[PDB]
Amino acid sequence: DENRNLVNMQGMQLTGYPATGTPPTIQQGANPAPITIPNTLMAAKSTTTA
């Protein structure tokens, strides 16, 4: 749609398991929420383990 949500042909939002964390992963028991595909850019990340 106009503000990046997966929406069917009439104006309702497809929902799923929300992704959180740094780095983001999927929590297999959370309460569902709409999905947004963001256009923001990835911030950098320092090295911790080689």
Add this chain to the structure above:
Amino acid sequence: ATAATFSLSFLNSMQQNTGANNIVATNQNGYKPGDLVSYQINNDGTVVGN
């Protein structure tokens, strides 16, 4: 707002090598407020408002 104290129960769990870890059931009895959408009469005899 006044914070609460609630009892959390991990009852009826298992550990029996079922592949990997996944939650199967979560529930509680708290809810945001709301107003009356619709009343209906079921066939057993009750009247229920959603």
Add this chain to the structure above:
Amino acid sequence: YSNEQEQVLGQIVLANFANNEGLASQGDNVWAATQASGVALLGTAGSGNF
């Protein structure tokens, strides 16, 4: 309007009732509220009982 702009001019209200089947007709395809029909109970078309 002609400058990449939107304005509002109003919003139509709807009117529920505590009780239908008590409204009377007075000629044209309209209904007049009566006693044993209730107060007006105006509202918006989006959510709630409407």
